[PDB]
Design a protein around this ligand. Sequence first.
Ligand code: WHD
Length: 284
Amino acid sequence: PKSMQCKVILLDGSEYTCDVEKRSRGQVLFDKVCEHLNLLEKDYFGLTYRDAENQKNWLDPAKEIKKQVRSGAWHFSFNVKFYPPDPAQLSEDITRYYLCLQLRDDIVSGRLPCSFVTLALLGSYTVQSELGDYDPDECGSDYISEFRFAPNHTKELEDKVIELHKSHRGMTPAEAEMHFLENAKKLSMYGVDLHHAKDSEGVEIMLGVCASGLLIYRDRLRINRFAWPKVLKISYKRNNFYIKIRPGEFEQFESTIGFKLPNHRAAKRLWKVCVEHHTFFRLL
Ligand SMILES: N#Cc1ccc(CNCc2ccc(F)cc2)cc1
């Protein structure tokens, strides 16, 4: 029985390598990675790969791996797929730990914008979880942490992390990670998957996919939001993406809203993530 080597970048930046049968469905690999991570609350997570166009794609666990990666390498990343709106409701601390690792990368990458003070507060909880209580012996007036906290590090940010870290004496790792998540979950771009698009007039917008629905970002002035329960049907056709909205009270007709995506693959990608979010957060 012929087996393919898989490589998976884990959220701590390490590599997990395993072999699966070449006709294996995505679930086979995902189960091996989750067992490696001692992760039981698996439903929030998934594997991504990079396509022939270098776009991030979710590996569909119900479909053959080979039919997805096609001509590319069996190289994947382990990621959060569904960001829980209330991380305190997760059963296990280790689930919150992996969600923290994802969010740290969302911040450093700049996908999750964050004020100076929130960058410092999140960094201070991470340090507290991983190193424990503040130690002046580890940090002089000129201290720079090995921890990546932000898309652009400054000395002022390092100092503020230390100042807040001093205030967390006696905090345990699960406690610190829960505080991290209580702050992170409030950020306006928390768990938002952003997609470049044009409206039915050709104006550049962003479509954001998240627990609370589909967000349209026209710019700092005018942001529309469609809660998932208001959405009856998501479709795509060529480069176009459409949402069918429930009729409003006393309105005779449903309303269909149309967007232009970069190409057909990008319309299909957006359709699939919206459908998956709609289903997940309907049931969660
Ligand atoms: N410079 C340099 C340099 C960078 C990376 C590596 C090893 N990368 C392994 C790896 C590949 C694909 C994958 F998905 C997971 C892990 C070695 C040297």
